[PDB]
Amino acid sequence: MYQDLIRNELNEAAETLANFLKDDANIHAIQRAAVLLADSFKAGGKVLSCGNGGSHCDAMHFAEELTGRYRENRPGYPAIAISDVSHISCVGNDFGFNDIFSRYVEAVGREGDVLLGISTSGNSANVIKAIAAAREKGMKVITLTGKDGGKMAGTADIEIRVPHFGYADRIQEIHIKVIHILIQLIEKEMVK
Amino acid sequence: MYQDLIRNELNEAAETLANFLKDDANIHAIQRAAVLLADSFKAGGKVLSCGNGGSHCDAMHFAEELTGRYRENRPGYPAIAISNDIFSRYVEAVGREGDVLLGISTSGNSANVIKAIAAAREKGMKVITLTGKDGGKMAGTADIEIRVPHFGYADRIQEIHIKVIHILIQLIEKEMVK
């Protein structure tokens, strides 16, 4: 019988969400993010999303939702989720410590574009390398993070940080809620 | 400007989690789902997961986490995520009696999930579904259905589905080391 266990997990997610919505700064960070993204599309830029693990799915839903919405009457792609095009992670043992995300920024980023880097610990080495490639490319940087923000703390133009300090599950669950919301706020921006 | 919209959507997530967690049937369905999954794995079976749009991702994380944890020293793949016959044709090509289909559909009306369910029954497989609203056309056709009582837009349902997936993975781990 694991009913206690189930309810504890769900309750912990409810405290996470509560803790998250209570801080104004988080709410303001999400609005700023959405404005940046939409300003950037409007200027003809695109966003590259990336994340490891479960966060790679968040990076994917965010790019494919924005692309599916804004591809009509626009060149290119408004958003792309960076993927392992050259199969560099096919040696297995993937800790994130690789140049899959920064390679991709180097090959396709342009000045004006946006990097959305997702990292539930703020320590993902591939995401830190993409932020540096982004800076070299002249792209603005949005991060969705957790805990104390890890080593990426301070390196993003806009950081949306989830105040949870244990395992990644609780933090990923708030990130996909943030992404659902970014996408609706951007739709309000994109008619204006 | 949007501050209120942001908080509103967060609060609606908080309302959805509270109404999901408050109904014992949803808690019991999660425990039974994990027990059937674990028991399948113990008997040498696999689980095929599928879903559309954002749900596809959830089906992907479910399958990859599970295969990552149990592949070593066990033949085959513990879980495979698939990708209107795109899911049924795969079930038809690889399902075996004793496997399990996990079909994810926030409205319960995904035609491609529905067809995968019917292929599953033809191969003698069990059926777990992650749903929303009233369970839609899928209601009744799963052996175990975890249904999110939210009757609005899909986003809020998906966000509970991923919490369910994270907990299944936990509970299956306790079952497997038993």
Delineate the domains of chain A, giving CATH numbers in brackets: 1-192 (3.40.50.10490)
B166, B174, B178, best to mutate vs chain A, most A CBs in 10 Å? B166
Determine the residue of chain B that is closest to A23 in CA distance. B7
**With contacts defined as CB-CB under 8 Å, which chain A residues touch B170?**
5, 9
Exposure class string for A135-167: b at 16+ Cβ within 10 A, else e: eebebbbbbbbbbebbebeebbbbbbbbebeee
- Nearest Cα of chain A lies from the Cα of B97 at a distance, in angstroms, of 27
Between CA A151 and CA A138 the distance in angstroms is: 21
Does B28 belong to an annotated binding site? no
CA torsion A162→A167→A170→A175, rounded to 10°?
A: 50
Chain A residues within 8 angstroms (CB to CB) of chain B: 1-3, 5-7, 9-11, 13-14, 17-18, 20-21, 27-28, 30-31, 34, 54, 57-58, 60-61, 169, 172-173, 176-177, 180-181, 184-185, 188
Tell me the resolution in Å: 2.0
Residue with tokens 């529905």: B114
Sign of CA dihedral A73, A79, A81, A84: positive
**In contact, B169 and B65? CB cutoff 8 Å:** yes
Experimental method, per PDB record: X-ray
Determine the residue of chain B that is closest to A57 in CA distance. B57
Between CA A97 and CA A90 the distance in angstroms is: 13
Helix (H, G, I), strand (E, B) or coil at A112: coil
B45: Cα separation from own chain's centroid: 17
